[PDB]
Design an enzyme around this catalytic site. Sequence first.
Site, mmCIF file in Angstrom:
data_model
loop_
_atom_site.group_PDB
_atom_site.id
_atom_site.type_symbol
_atom_site.label_atom_id
_atom_site.label_comp_id
_atom_site.label_asym_id
_atom_site.label_seq_id
_atom_site.Cartn_x
_atom_site.Cartn_y
_atom_site.Cartn_z
ATOM 1 N N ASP A 98 0.738 -1.284 0.112
ATOM 2 C CA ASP A 98 -0.073 0.033 0.074
ATOM 3 C C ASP A 98 0.773 1.321 0.112
ATOM 4 O O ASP A 98 1.132 1.992 1.058
ATOM 5 C CB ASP A 98 -0.970 -0.140 1.211
ATOM 6 N N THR A 99 0.866 1.843 -1.178
ATOM 7 C CA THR A 99 1.628 3.274 -1.309
ATOM 8 C C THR A 99 0.860 4.460 -0.589
ATOM 9 O O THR A 99 1.391 5.557 -0.584
ATOM 10 C CB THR A 99 1.878 3.440 -2.788
ATOM 11 N N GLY A 100 -0.501 4.416 -0.365
ATOM 12 C CA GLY A 100 -0.934 5.545 0.313
ATOM 13 C C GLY A 100 -1.066 5.185 1.789
ATOM 14 O O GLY A 100 -1.949 5.858 2.526
HETATM 15 C C1 LIG Z 1 -2.568 4.108 7.889
HETATM 16 C C2 LIG Z 1 -3.121 3.826 6.371
HETATM 17 C C3 LIG Z 1 -4.144 2.861 6.843
HETATM 18 C C4 LIG Z 1 -3.682 5.194 6.183
HETATM 19 N N1 LIG Z 1 -4.086 5.241 4.454
HETATM 20 C C5 LIG Z 1 -5.354 4.971 4.216
HETATM 21 O O1 LIG Z 1 -6.211 4.695 4.688
HETATM 22 C C6 LIG Z 1 -5.039 4.883 2.484
HETATM 23 C C7 LIG Z 1 -5.582 6.456 2.060
HETATM 24 C C8 LIG Z 1 -5.387 7.593 2.752
HETATM 25 C C9 LIG Z 1 -4.114 8.257 3.007
HETATM 26 C C10 LIG Z 1 -3.952 9.459 3.888
HETATM 27 C C11 LIG Z 1 -5.163 10.078 4.441
HETATM 28 C C12 LIG Z 1 -6.449 9.471 4.003
HETATM 29 C C13 LIG Z 1 -6.669 8.094 3.350
HETATM 30 C C14 LIG Z 1 -6.092 3.983 1.972
HETATM 31 C C15 LIG Z 1 -5.769 2.652 1.839
HETATM 32 O O2 LIG Z 1 -4.804 2.425 0.859
HETATM 33 C C16 LIG Z 1 -6.940 1.800 1.937
HETATM 34 C C17 LIG Z 1 -6.733 0.283 2.278
HETATM 35 C C18 LIG Z 1 -7.557 -0.534 2.564
HETATM 36 C C19 LIG Z 1 -8.174 -1.263 1.293
HETATM 37 C C20 LIG Z 1 -9.340 -1.981 1.489
HETATM 38 C C21 LIG Z 1 -10.093 -2.153 2.841
HETATM 39 C C22 LIG Z 1 -9.601 -1.083 3.924
HETATM 40 C C23 LIG Z 1 -8.397 -0.400 3.652
HETATM 41 N N2 LIG Z 1 -7.709 1.542 0.555
HETATM 42 C C24 LIG Z 1 -8.820 2.147 0.460
HETATM 43 O O3 LIG Z 1 -9.304 3.105 1.354
HETATM 44 O O4 LIG Z 1 -9.572 1.998 -0.638
HETATM 45 C C25 LIG Z 1 -10.545 2.774 -0.994
HETATM 46 C C26 LIG Z 1 -11.231 2.053 -2.656
HETATM 47 C C27 LIG Z 1 -11.816 2.199 -0.262
HETATM 48 C C28 LIG Z 1 -10.521 4.197 -1.272
HETATM 49 C C29 LIG Z 1 -3.053 6.437 6.373
HETATM 50 N N3 LIG Z 1 -1.934 7.019 5.139
HETATM 51 C C30 LIG Z 1 -1.303 7.985 5.925
HETATM 52 C C31 LIG Z 1 -2.054 8.300 7.057
HETATM 53 N N4 LIG Z 1 -2.750 7.271 7.313
#
Ligand SMILES: CC(C)[C@H](NC(=O)[C@H](Cc1ccccc1)C[C@H](O)[C@H](Cc1ccccc1)NC(=O)OC(C)(C)C)c1ncc[nH]1
Lengths: 99, 99
Positions: free
Chosen positions: A25-27
């Site tokens: 997961d890059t996000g």
């Molecule tokens: C710690 C991780 C979990 C978190 N990142 C995410 O949730 C990122 C995006 C984000 C970054 C920064 C702020 C808000 C949102 C999204 C994840 O990649 C999540 C991982 C996941 C997949 C499937 C089910 C549950 C979770 N993917 C996700 O939300 O996908 C959809 C399609 C629903 C947009 C994060 N990155 C930085 C700060 N927090």
Amino acid sequence: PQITLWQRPLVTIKIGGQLKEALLDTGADDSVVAGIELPGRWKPKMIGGIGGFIKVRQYDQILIEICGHKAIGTVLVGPTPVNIIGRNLLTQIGCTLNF
Amino acid sequence: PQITLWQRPLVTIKIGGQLKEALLDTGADDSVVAGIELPGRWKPKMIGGIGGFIKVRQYDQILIEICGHKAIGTVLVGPTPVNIIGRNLLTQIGCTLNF
Ligand SMILES: CC(C)[C@H](NC(=O)[C@H](Cc1ccccc1)C[C@H](O)[C@H](Cc1ccccc1)NC(=O)OC(C)(C)C)c1ncc[nH]1
């Protein structure tokens, strides 16, 4: 290896003797794994995603083997739907995004 | 381009005339952008990460330009914390994960 994104980029991880599947997961800045017995101490931490925050436990210096590559970093354990291998571990195994 | 993950993989997008920055996310099936005004019609769909589900509006056949590479796909409009370019668009710009 070069992973194409047509299917979910799942990988196998070995953490605490337990075998599980996780998302590259890059996000995700942080890695969060659910349902594993990890020993030792923890600090509170609250991480945000879309739809909000969850309270997890910050475990430090945990060894992780991500697709047969060795890394030691921070692992958050708590209410996640899918096990996430975020950038704090992805950098150690030298993972890049290409296009 | 080859992006190392020591810093967040933020890239420029041109979507429906509006310029914004979006995170390249391998862990997102779908793409969701906040704040833009978008032409046409939409269906309801609720999407969820860690934390919970949120209600988004899905417009299909939207022209998005991710760092000079043009692609057309489903963009979801809803209250997200950061803009996410999910695998449905990443496959069209030829994005692959490498290590
Ligand atoms: C710690 C991780 C979990 C978190 N990142 C995410 O949730 C990122 C995006 C984000 C970054 C920064 C702020 C808000 C949102 C999204 C994840 O990649 C999540 C991982 C996941 C997949 C499937 C089910 C549950 C979770 N993917 C996700 O939300 O996908 C959809 C399609 C629903 C947009 C994060 N990155 C930085 C700060 N927090």
